[PDB]
Symmetry: D2
Subunit: 123 residues, 4 copies
């Protein structure tokens, strides 16, 4: 975990993020887009639960990216929840929620759900 989490990660779509896993569960870094209504780099911040593991379990973690930077303001934010598995083929398996700001009437359709798997090699 932590040291093994620090570094560059890539998903299938092409998205990339660089993260630093701090000693006390913090995750800080940048996400750079590859395919959605995101463009460029965005700040990412999250947390991980280190014990984490005498039974080769994953390390739970999560992070958020608000889709606003100096070139785009998408009025939305995504949170990824999942776990880190280390080793030869270490990976972070996640499920995500993307919420867009809507009026009260359209609030029911404000959140999309999906999944992403990140690896240290692309892809």
């Amino acid at each position: 975990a932590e040291a093994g989490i620090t570094g560059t990660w890539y998903n299938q779509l092409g998205s990339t993020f660089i993260v630093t896993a701090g000693a006390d569960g913090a995750l800080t870094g940048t996400y750079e887009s590859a395919v959605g209504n995101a463009e460029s780099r965005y700040v990412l911040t999250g947390r991980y639960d280190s014990a984490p593991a005498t039974d080769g379990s994953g390390t739970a973690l999560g992070w958020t990216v608000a889709w606003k930077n100096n070139y785009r303001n998408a009025h939305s934010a995504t949170t990824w929840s999942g776990q880190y598995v280390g080793g030869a083929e270490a990976r972070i398996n996640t499920q995500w929620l993307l919420t867009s700001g809507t009026t009260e009437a359209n609030a029911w359709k404000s959140t999309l759900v999906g999944h992403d798997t990140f690896t240290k090699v692309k892809p």
Copy 2:
């Protein structure tokens, strides 16, 4: 948003969190439990997309809480994704994902999904 986000929030279950919405989209604070395998206060970190809004839309945001502090280590983390609506009865409507670290075999059952609504009054 931001100023209106800063403060104390409560949900139905009894959970409470205090957050500070920083000038550049940051959200930092503490979450104090009321009903799950959480006990005490945990650090919370997230982001919000301010434009946010000439059509009374919500401000999208998200945050993460790793369930580890000096009294408990639950080996899990939760991410809340949703939007802030201000006014007389301001609220944050969210959907959450809670992932627990599991072995590869039990990974398919590692994530729970739910929702939470927070208000400035309890409840």
Copy 3:
């Protein structure tokens, strides 16, 4: 469960559905819209797991509605997953997934997630 499930149900939004819980776990009925890109009545089909319960537990169930009838063809379908709780104030608490048919490129944004609570009184 079953007998207690059979009948008319209403949610907050105004949606209504009438269902018959058959002896062998089947759920058949119609859903009539109140607020989304649905209009009129649609066929609903699902299943419930009766044991269901010496510890006042809910009865798990789920159903699907394809948003196509003689007046509208929304190219989408919603599934509701949740449980039935009976009694004075019986209810069905659910979480739903709504998928729209998209091209491969937009598949990542094809599914919305939300929740609905149904009661026997409106609302």
Copy 4:
């Protein structure tokens, strides 16, 4: 869609289901387990929205399986929501919700979320 949906489907985990897509949006069949607290065959029922598509879009559909048969009664049900894509390598990409009957206190942790991709070849 429909004809192309009828047949046998397999996912990564090993699960298999045979379905018949009826003329008027119905989906009926059986799901046979491979890895969860399911054992044997279970009845599956769902619906699909045929228009479905002058822009090679998927056909939205969904189905439910209550995990009860003559050998097991898991007190739970799963709903899969997704779309069918046909062709050389036709597939059904889905996201699922699995709800277990719980007492009111544990209702917040009653639903798991995940995804499954089914193909006509295993896997």
